[PDB]
Amino acid sequence: GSESEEVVSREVSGIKAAYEAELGDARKTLDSVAKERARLQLELSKVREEFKELKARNTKKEGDLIAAQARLKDLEALLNSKEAALSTALSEKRTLEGELHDLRGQVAKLEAALGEAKKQLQDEMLRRVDAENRLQTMKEELDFQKNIYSEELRETKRRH
Amino acid sequence: GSESEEVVSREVSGIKAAYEAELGDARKTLDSVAKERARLQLELSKVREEFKELKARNTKKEGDLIAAQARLKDLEALLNSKEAALSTALSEKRTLEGELHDLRGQVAKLEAALGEAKKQLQDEMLRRVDAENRLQTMKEELDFQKNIYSEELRE
């Protein structure tokens, strides 16, 4: 009767209260996952941004690196050419200094030889001038000896 | 009249089934959001790994760049020193070639002067020898002419 209606009302209230407790524990787990989802969304948004910025920085750095490496290659090659040119120039200079030293010795040797050849020519010109003057005097003596021979024997044979 | 009691039995069974259905839907929704957490965790794991790899590559590239820039700076300076040294060496070489040209002209001028001084000495020595020979012959003629003078005046 009334005990049959009370047992159902207390049963429904029991199963109602159990469901309310379980759905409440399901709501509490739902918010927990909602917080973690929000944490991950923010953390993902942070890393994506950092990656975008890092990729932009790296793209610039790598392009700068390729350019530096190309310039380095060109400079190392030019430095090698310059060193070769310098090595040749110093070698050629060394040969010149040697030729120059040899020529300086030659000038000094030719100057001494020229001075002595001129000194000997000077003395010989004097001896030639003297010998030619003494010859003219000897020719003059011979003509005067031949003239006194003739002008005297012209008068000797006539005066006995 | 147990039809009045079958109404309450069907109501309780309906209440039970409705609460039982709400629990099943809440559990399937919890799965639905757990899938979305899993999606984000995987997506985050992917980007973190890509970033770690990119940061490692960039760290190496930047260190390589600093080194290249330092080497460039040193080279440009060394290249400038080498060009100055080269410019000096060619200038010094040019002065040497000038001194050499001047010395070669001096040797040629001294050689020509020496050859002509020797040629003049040669001709002068001949004139002296000839004049001294003609003088000795003239002295010999004068003594003969003075002796024939004394021998003819005798008789």
Question: By the 8 A CB rule, do B100 and A103 touch?
Answer: yes
Within 10 A of B24 (CB to CB), how many other CB atoms are there? 10
Torsion sign, CA atoms A134, A139, A140, A145: positive
Q: Where are the beta strands (DSSP E) in chain B?
A: none
Torsion sign, CA atoms B61, B64, B66, B69: negative
C-alpha distances (whole Å) from A153 to each of A141, B152, B155 are 18, 9, 11
Question: Structure resolution in Å?
Answer: 2.6
Q: How far apart, in whole angstroms, are the C-alpha atoms of residue A31 and residue A144?
A: 165
Interface test with A, best of B54, B80, B102 (most A CBs within 10 A): B54
Q: How far apart, in whole angstroms, are the C-alpha atoms of residue A104 and residue A109?
A: 9
Contacts of B30 in chain A (CB under 8 A): 26, 29-30, 33
CA A100 to chain centre: 29
Q: Which of A15, A62, A72 sits opposite B72 (nearest CB)?
A: A72
Within 10 A of A61 (CB to CB), how many other CB atoms are there? 16
**Structural domains of chain A, count:** 1
Q: How far apart, in whole angstroms, are the C-alpha atoms of residue A119 and residue B124?
A: 13
Q: How far apart, in whole angstroms, are the C-alpha atoms of residue B72 and residue A76?
A: 9
Question: By the 8 A CB rule, do B124 and A121 touch?
Answer: yes
Question: By the 8 A CB rule, do A108 and B105 touch?
Answer: no
Contacts of B151 in chain A (CB under 8 A): none
Domain with B137 in it: 1-155
